Design a protein around this ligand. Structure first.
Ligand SMILES: Nc1nc2c(ncn2[C@@H]2O[C@H](CO)[C@@H](O)[C@H]2OP(=O)(O)O)c(=O)[nH]1
Length: 104
């Protein structure tokens, strides 16, 4: 069964830790990838009650199992903080426009 289900996409904890480790080292290195320049700040417009503190950063998580390296980010994201603490897994899947909803 899925630890996080983003629409139709299924992720285990391992998938999430892997994406997150990747996202956080580029953040620490001040490196960005992709046309959207990931990882980038996540403002939490949605108002998600995360149990970890701000600021937050979002990094894509791919259904392929591959780590993001440019190209299309897909609709799923891992949100981590400055301490490299997981805040949550979110998606545009099922959200209207560029809004986000949590992955279950
Ligand atoms: N919906 C949403 N988009 C955010 C937030 N923070 C940054 N973004 C960005 O705000 C714009 C409109 O949503 C996009 O550039 C989006 O980028 P992402 O698509 O890369 O996440 C946030 O909290 N919510």
């Amino acid at each position: 069964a899925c630890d996080y289900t983003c629409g139709s996409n299924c992720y285990s904890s391992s998938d999430v830790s892997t994406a997150q480790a990747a996202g956080y080292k580029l953040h620490e290195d001040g490196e960005t990838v992709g046309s959207n320049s990931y990882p980038h700040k996540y403002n939490n417009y949605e108002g998600f009650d995360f149990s970890v503190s701000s600021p937050y950063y979002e990094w894509p998580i791919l259904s392929s199992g591959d780590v993001y390296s440019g190209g299309s980010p897909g609709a799923d994201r891992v949100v981590f903080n400055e301490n490299n603490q997981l805040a949550g897994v979110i998606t545009h899947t099922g959200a209207s426009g560029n809004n986000f909803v949590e992955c279950t």
